[PDB]
Subunit: 326 residues, 4 copies
């Protein structure tokens, strides 16, 4: 089987950052990515604007210069392609890592390639950089399985003249709602919190709150969805149910990390905090030679880590592996 | 059954134009559309720019104002949503017309709604405005059924650092190849023709020719694809076969109208140029009170009907239907 | 001499709206504009975004559809050209109205053409729609006449690596300051007020406030500029003077109507606020058959009138003139 | 006061030359009469580059675009970040007036923004002044009228006006297209007998299409004879034709400042408009005076772009470091 010094699981911004940090200390690691690079950004809404200035998304010292103050999805996609090209990062794309298990003082890494075939690698060190956008916080309500329900937003156009519910109260729900209004949908927002979430970016709240206050966006605080049918949706507020006409649902209920992936390879999870155990100055978990990078290191507050700070995890990893040599 | 004077099948630009033309003679017809309005434009590539100025896309005298010279996909989407709102066009969306059958002096139209249920309408006149983008020209080659083969192009990003073949010599083939180069794919173009088609827009060809001349795009004229496998593609030129490494295929071989749908309706087709029989000054087919509007009326390898001239078909239909309704 | 029923002075959005309103009652008036149509928007900052959605800028029922939520300068320019073309509004462009004088039961209108020649018109009714962007609120401090001092902002690029002061506290000041920061200028903002103006776009204030908080923008409330030199600027806060290094000044201190123009034609103005006297149900001034349209009706401070509501003044003018023939 | 190298002009090629010298251990002084990339700043607002953004990169600073071709404001943002990231030394708003030999060094006299004078002594000179500052004047009556412009910025204020564009350059075609989009009534006059071969092949079709459908009046073999406030007169064949005209864009191209070059000892041949230089060093016939950018181009001012002009600094830097 194929031997690697380091395998990085995940080719998002923070896994790519860790690859480059390792290159700078003389190790050219293998990134294994189930889609192509920055798959999460590719799966952002088509016209998404970042909240970070573009300088704060830079990795590998490659300049990310923009004429506007904040970049959009397609600009970031172009940037990270150029980073990977200029730095010759090694990416095995369309390859899903299935399992990581101890094998002596190394690790066997089993994968599934695009055509369905299996592959096994031996690696001395592992960087888990898998993020969490693959794992929606499902509601587990009847009808959530219908095709009219989605946990990702792409574009508003096809919801023109339709009745649409957005579930959630954070920026993904506000962004989808505003795009849906612009596209001519009739929008209802349902949110379990009792007031506007303090996480809504201060430059987006004014427009959203104004559309709520004048009734353009119907908004139910303290709402808990109970049922989704093809043409209706039922929710409760203070235990009293309301049923509304509904064509499509965007369940913008957040995401969670796949901790079963970590625990199966020896990494412990800290209850109450929800973080994997790691030592910050190495970004090494409790499992020797298993490191983490990016938002996979966050706890119950999934917003602790983003690109601006997660892009530096690879620096501590590279310093540690370099000192240990191969 | 719901009674209608006119049913328009398809809510693309030309079907919507025909609706507004009928409004001017006192008939607000029912448009039945299997997605939402201008589904074909929604399914254009994300980066798409029109070759027409925006004035030539206008319908219903609704101004289409652009600061740039040529509109882009999302500008046209916003425009046609506002046309339908401002002109009160009646659209039954997410509803697919399955059958049109003469009943007496009217037509029975059977449909499937989004929830799978069936509807039946009785209409005095039919306008078929279904375009051709739904029906790719299949190459009839082993392996074309694989998921790695697409007959549509959407975005280039996930093909970064992949070996990609584009098949065809249409504007769409050239456009896809250029966007794939921009996205860092390694692009091979295969075309059965021996020279560049004269239909390639004269302002698009020089960039493509330059990338062929400097070796960036591998270009094979007189190429016929014989086989697609998961990892290879085999084609012949002058009978000599070549197998190349290949990850993904864009079969950009054009589209054709749904003649089966027309022939089951009673409409005759010309066998060598797939053009339905119709009288141009009425846009009425050989089947009494079944009209056509838009690019469906075109034949050979098209290039005769686009939005600029297809948007006026409804004027002839409306004048004919008005005469028979007074 | 050329005879007109109605002459509209100024071809900005509200003057054009007044023309289309009069068209709808059978009167196609003459618009006389010293530049070309919507000169004021043409002289907005290059990358300016409107605070109104595009539907609120529409006139003459001409659709103003945008893919984004707020239009930018170049989109509005394209829109109003198409309005004038599609509605066949008559515009005499590059023609400056110099005087309006009563002449029987009509008005003599004297103008200066682009080539320097003079022209005279007789109009039965006058609509003054001249706005205020032509007339900065000057600070009358020494050094204000130096070429390094401007009362308009266009683009930030050439102020890269330069020390720049922005004076004022309206959206124009905040927008200029942010663009200058993005362009690499070292920005100081000086404002005579003691808190943020409630007119600042609520979605723009947080970015500005964040840049004051982290020290990127030097912000001085209660500031009064006392002197400008080629390389310095002196201002006081609480009577304490501070002198700072300074290359360029953007005095974004607002604008006021052409008072000499209105009073010489017989219109009364309030000397403190600058507002002309008028009756809102007709938009007619104290001088019979002289009307006003647009932001000129709002004065040395304005704000209360913008395109959103000013685009409707012509309706009241049209109903009045139509009934009077 | 003293330097080592002074670069005259802070356009892309002058800035590239500065970073190339930095690579060899010399941090030179750029003196620019406006701010950096003044010429790009004075491009038309709508301007799109014909080069992909990779071809505009200097100093290995990535120029990332999602679009295929960058626009004016993207390049402005790029070159500002380059100057910041590389710490290029720029004396802005300072016009170099004279360069004169002084011993084995050079005296350079400048005028600052406030009017002050300054003098530096430099061992080497790089002349990177471009040509966009010096329009090819037509020397015809009426060219001095304010209705005549040798630069194009925006089309909007020409809405519903009669406008003449003179010239057969890409800039002429570009201006005509933008004026049509802005609703001007456009006549194009060109002394040549057919469409100029320099027009980019992806721009000519749009222009020819508007000529063929009658939107643009196009006169070949046209020589302007007079411009008044409301008319313009030109000849075609032997026939003089007078048309109504409000505004004129004289898009006749540009030429380097040959007076500035000759006065410092640079020879410019006669027929071409090219300075004498050796390409391997980009050094002129005057020792230790170099050229960088489009100033090196002759009669065919298309032969040097940013794409290849951005490398002149490398041959400069090699030659200077060898002599240091
Ligand atoms: C709409 C939106 C806007 C945002 N705006 C910003 C912003 O402005 N600034 C900011 O800092 N953050 C922003 N974020 C958050 C940002 O997307 C994340 O912080 C970032 O993606 C984290 O990077 P990562 O490398 O840790 O994980 P990810 O980018 O999620 O990458 C993990 C990768 O691992 C891959 N993967 C997972 N499992 C496997 C497996 N078994 N085998 C192989 N590959 C696997 C996935 O395909 C994925 O590409 C935004 C997020 C959204 C949704
Ligand atoms: C990349 C690209 C760029 C283009 N650029 C231009 C350009 O610049 N200018 C231009 O004029 N043209 C352009 N075209 C062509 C343009 O898309 C067509 O001319 C136009 O779509 C024709 O309009 P139509 O209404 O006749 O058909 P369509 O737009 O194809 O509309 C047909 C509709 O019928 C619906 N439908 C089909 N079958 C059924 C059914 N059984 N029941 C219900 N609904 C049904 C479909 O969902 C679809 O919405 C471009 C095309 C592409 C692909
Ligand atoms: C940066 C900026 C952003 C703005 N954003 C918005 C926004 O989002 N929404 C909004 O509603 N408003 C906005 N405004 C305000 C808007 O510009 C004004 O409300 C609008 O211009 C008022 O229209 P008007 O026709 O009354 O005046 P103007 O547009 O000023 O028109 C007056 C015209 O009269 C002409 N004129 C003057 N004197 C003479 C003379 N003697 N002879 C002939 N012609 C003459 C001028 O050349 C000018 O074209 C913004 C303003 C600025 C500066
Ligand atoms: C509309 C347009 C589009 C173009 N598109 C492209 C394109 O896509 N790709 C491409 O490669 N090229 C393009 N060009 C050409 C491009 O502008 C030039 O190739 C480029 O500017 C050359 O760079 P430079 O540094 O040599 O000269 P310039 O950029 O002209 O720089 C010369 C500088 O010297 C300064 N200067 C002059 N005299 C003095 C003095 N006495 N003292 C101090 N400073 C002085 C000037 O202010 C100026 O900033 C385009 C040009 C135009 C007009
Ligand atoms: Na919720
Ligand atoms: Na083919
Ligand atoms: Na002030
Ligand atoms: Na000429």
């Amino acid at each position: 089987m194929q031997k690697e010094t380091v395998i990085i699981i995940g080719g998002g911004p923070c896994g790519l950052a860790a690859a480059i940090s390792l290159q700078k200390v003389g190790i050219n690691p293998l990134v294994i990515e189930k889609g192509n690079i920055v798959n999460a950004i590719y799966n952002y809404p088509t016209h998404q604007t970042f909240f970070s200035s573009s300088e704060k998304l830079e990795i590998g010292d490659v300049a990310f210069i923009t004429e506007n103050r904040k970049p959009v999805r397609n600009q970031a996609l172009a940037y990270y392609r150029e980073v990977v090209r200029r730095k010759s990062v090694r990416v095995n794309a369309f390859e899903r890592v299935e399992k990581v298990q101890k094998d002596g003082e190394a690790f066997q890494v089993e994968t599934t390639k695009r055509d369905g075939s299996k592959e096994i690698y031996i690696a001395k060190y592992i960087v888990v950089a898998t993020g969490y956008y693959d794992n929606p916080n499902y509601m587990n309500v009847p009808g959530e399985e219908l095709k009219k329900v989605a946990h990702y937003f792409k574009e508003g156009h096809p919801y023109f003249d339709r009745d649409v519910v957005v579930i959630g109260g954070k920026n993904s729900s506000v962004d989808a709602a505003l795009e849906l209004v612009k596209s001519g949908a009739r929008v209802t927002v349902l949110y379990r919190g009792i007031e506007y979430s303090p996480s809504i970016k201060p430059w987006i709240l004014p427009e959203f709150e104004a559309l709520v206050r004048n009734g353009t966006i119907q908004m139910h605080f303290g709402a808990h969805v109970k049922e989704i049918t093809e043409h209706t949706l039922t929710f409760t507020v203070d235990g009293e149910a309301l049923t509304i006409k509904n064509d499509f649902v965007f369940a913008m209920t957040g995401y969670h990390p796949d901790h079963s992936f970590l625990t199966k390879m020896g990494v412990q999870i800290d209850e109450e905090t929800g973080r994997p155990f790691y030592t910050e100055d190495r970004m090494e978990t409790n499992a020797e030679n298993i490191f983490i990078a990016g938002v996979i290191a966050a706890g119950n507050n999934a917003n602790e880590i983003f690109i601006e700070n997660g892009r530096f995890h690879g620096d501590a990893i590279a310093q540690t592996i370099a000192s240990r040599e191969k």
